[PDB]
Design a protein. Structure first.
Lengths: 534, 150
């Protein structure tokens, strides 16, 4: 799923050095991105959406239940007229991407946080350089407005989601020559108000300066689409305890890269449950975070973990692997990882996995382990006392693995909270109704706005008409659509047309055809008694 | 004598996206007001003055010239037929005049009608369209003054 955000604002009317405006260059770049992505044999399941800088009823051009034909037709007729309302457009796009999330089961907020339930989405937000306006002045903060929150959105406290990356294109093409071609293989950043918003999600922001640089950035962007598993790392709290082959001193601490969870839907178990201590009676649930604040500690702690535990291959995208490569990729050794923010009743973090590398030393495998592996792996009334340290709802998925061996547990203590189940079906129904109402009025514009609003300065109610583009005057049916110049000739033409008594008469003077004239479409409505047997 | 009924579709003729239809409607209403004097005629004339005043700020120079060249004698006849409209018309004229005062000073000209402010009317060729519009406004104001004074 790819949602292209093209502003089509009035500031996108300035002409480049090639002769076309920035909007035409953006549309051409989108078309070349389409034809480049079509090369990879994986573009048979994705869906394209379009978002412009227009009113909430008119911002979306093609959303759910819209094929490629209507999407291309809407992107073709894009007009650059309006202000640069970036915040409202980003909010509308994020709400559109989060319409079918509370109904299928993604981010249920009650049963862990399953990383194998993915809904990838990439935003391009092709906008102008700077100087965004909000009908009052020029702002320099880019704060997303919060006026009408969706039902069930206060449990994340952030507009974007687990898998929602945000790339940006500014299209800073000069007007005279664009002769800046010193650095060949180098794509700098835009350094604008959208740069922090993009970096928070996990995607960079390109700075287009030349058509060659545009082609380079488009060819570099097609290689950044996969399953979205974005997790945040922190150096705390080990004081860079990497004393293995050298001495530490770094910027590879707050790594917020993605992870490629390739399927073999995705197959996996043992998710990151949450970051708080869930109580048995809690009417209000604390809001989750889109990026989990999980921290790693550099300790050997028996990296050899061999068992019949179901295996996972959530591949990690190499972005800050320099710190690992400095220590020879940690051969035959790993380092634990633990989620912060009160992972248990009374403690600060519980190691639930590690980041052991592969034998090929190519990337990090991201070995996800159970909540507390070094205890259950090595019954004398031990498991009954051990199952009290883990979160309650967490007994859900692990028991499935126990199904591979037997079934000692039951549904006696399989209860998260009596108040968490309530006020959940109503929120899901409200979200479904909102998604249906949004998908219903998605393409039907029905503007019907043509007036001059004649002010005084039949009274207080007059309004002069405006020039209608698609008027289609009926010359043979309506007599008012016949001007004075070609009146007598048109009169004789109408007379001859009425006195001819032909078959299948029409009221159009000369209606040649539409913009498209297909050969197969016209040849299908015919009959040819021939087969060419010879 | 059956022309008064045309008033019943004079406003409908004004609300048209074509400037020629609006100009013809304004001229026809001007002639109907200089011929017939009725309260309905006064209301339609006031509506025409309003829609002409609101069209000054939504038309370009090339269209403003072509729309305000024929429609000034209409204002002259409106003043001749309806005294209470005088002020309004004057105000309107002033506005239009000031607009022309900003159109001539924009681009260089050949006659420079700005210094011609201290000139008098003399009883009774190819030039600039803005200068022609200024001269037409001045002439129509002169005719309105001569009609009201005499």
């Amino acid at each position: 799923i790819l949602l292209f955000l093209i502003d089509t604002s009035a500031s996108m009317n300035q002409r480049s050095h090639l002769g076309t405006t920035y909007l035409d260059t953006a549309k051409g770049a989108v078309e070349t991105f389409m034809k480049l992505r079509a090369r990879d044999p994986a573009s048979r399941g994705d869906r394209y959406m379009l978002v412009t800088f227009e009113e909430p009823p008119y911002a979306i051009k093609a959303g759910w239940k819209e094929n490629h034909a209507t999407f291309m037709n809407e992107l073709k007729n894009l007009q650059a007229e309006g202000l640069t309302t970036l915040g409202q457009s980003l909010r509308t796009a994020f709400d559109l991407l989060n319409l079918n999330r509370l109904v299928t089961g993604i981010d249920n907020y009650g049963q862990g946080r399953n990383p194998f339930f993915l809904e990838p989405a990439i935003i391009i937000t092709i906008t102008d350089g700077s100087k965004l306006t909000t009908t009052s002045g020029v702002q320099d903060e880019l704060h997303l407005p919060l006026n009408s929150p969706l039902p069930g959105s206060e449990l994340t406290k952030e507009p974007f989601r687990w898998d929602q990356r945000l790339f940006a294109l500014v299209l800073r093409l000069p007007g005279t020559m664009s002769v800046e071609s010193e650095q060949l293989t180098g794509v700098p950043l835009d350094d604008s108000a959208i740069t922090p918003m993009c970096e928070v999600t996990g995607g960079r922001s390109y700075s287009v300066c030349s058509p060659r640089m545009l082609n380079q950035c488009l060819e570099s962007l097609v290689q950044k689409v996969q399953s979205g598993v974005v997790i945040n790392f922190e150096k705390a709290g080990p004081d860079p305890s990497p004393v293995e082959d050298g001495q530490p001193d770094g910027s590879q601490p707050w790594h917020s890269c993605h992870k490629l969870i390739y399927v073999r839907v995705p197959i996996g178990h043992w998710p990151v449950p949450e970051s708080f201590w869930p109580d048995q009676n809690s009417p209000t649930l604390p809001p989750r975070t889109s990026h989990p604040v999980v921290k790693f500690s550099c300790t050997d702690c028996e990296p050899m973990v061999i068992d019949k535990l179901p295996f996972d291959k959530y591949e990690l995208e190499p972005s800050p692997l320099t710190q690992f490569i400095l220590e020879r990729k940690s051969p035959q050794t790993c380092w634990q990882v633990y989620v912060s923010n009160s992972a248990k009743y009374s403690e600060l973090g519980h190691p639930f996995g590690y980041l052991k590398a592969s034998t090929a030393l190519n990337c990090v495998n991201l070995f996800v382990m159970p909540y507390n592996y070094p205890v259950l792996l090595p019954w004398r009334q031990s498991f009954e006392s051990y199952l009290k340290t883990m979160p309650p709802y967490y007994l859900g998925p692990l028991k499935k693995a126990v199904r591979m061996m037997g079934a000692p547990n039951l549904i006696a203590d399989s209860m998260e909270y009596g108040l968490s189940y309530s006020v959940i079906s109503y929120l899901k129904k409200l979200s479904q109704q909102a998604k249906i109402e949004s998908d219903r009025v998605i393409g039907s514009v029905g503007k019907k706005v043509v007036q001059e609003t004649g002010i005084k300065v039949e009274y207080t109610g007059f309004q002069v008409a405006l020039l209608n583009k698609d008027l289609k005057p009926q010359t043979f049916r309506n007599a008012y659509d016949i001007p004075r110049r070609n009146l007598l000739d048109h009169l004789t033409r109408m007379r001859s047309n009425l006195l001819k008594s032909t078959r299948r008469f029409l009221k159009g003077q000369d209606e040649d055809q539409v913009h498209s004239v297909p050969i197969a479409q016209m040849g299908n409505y015919q009959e040819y008694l021939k087969q060419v047997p010879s | 004598p059956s022309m008064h009924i045309c008033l019943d579709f004079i406003p409908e003729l004004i609300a048209q996206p074509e400037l020629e239809k609006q100009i013809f409607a304004i001229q026809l209403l001007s002639h109907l007001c200089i011929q017939y004097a009725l309260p309905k005629s006064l209301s339609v004339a006031r509506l025409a003055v309003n829609v002409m005043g609101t069209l000054l700020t939504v038309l370009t120079q090339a269209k403003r010239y072509a729309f305000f060249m024929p429609t000034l004698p209409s204002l002259v006849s409106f003043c001749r037929a309806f005294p209470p409209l005088y002020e309004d018309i004057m105000s309107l004229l002033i506005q239009i005049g000031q607009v022309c005062a900003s159109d001539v000073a924009t681009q260089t000209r050949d006659i420079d009608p700005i210094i011609t402010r201290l000139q008098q009317i003399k009883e009774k060729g190819s030039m600039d369209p803005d200068v022609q519009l200024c001269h037409c406004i001045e002439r129509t104001v002169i005719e309105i003054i001569n009609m009201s004074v005499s």
